[PDB]
Amino acid sequence: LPIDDTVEGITGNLFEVYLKPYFLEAYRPIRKGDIFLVRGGMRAVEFKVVETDPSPYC
Amino acid sequence: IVAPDTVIHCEGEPIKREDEEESLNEVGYDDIGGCRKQLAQIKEMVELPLRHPALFKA
DSSP: OBOGGGSSSOOSOOIIIIIHHHSTTTOOOOOTTOEEEEEOSSOEEEEEOOOOSSOSOO | OOOTTSOOOOOSOOOOOOTTOOOTTSOOGGGOOSOHHHHHHHHHHHHHHHHOHHHHHO
């Protein structure tokens, strides 16, 4: 989920613009409870991993 | 289109304006001469932040 004070000015869809090249080819191990940061597009925005179905190490 | 055949009536009292109407009390860009480069620079600095505050905030 996005966080409000970093999306006060940006709008539209953030999925293909930010999140799709972020997890591409890097094989990033994420966990329920972490907050990462994505730069690009004249703005840096953060995302908190809210809910994952499997075990937290994945 | 105003034709020369069309008669022009000027009968009536000098009336006041609507309150939202502007006048020559304020000054526009035409009343300034000889400093086109500096006026261009001030337009570049000032217009784009003030005309579009939400866009420039984004």
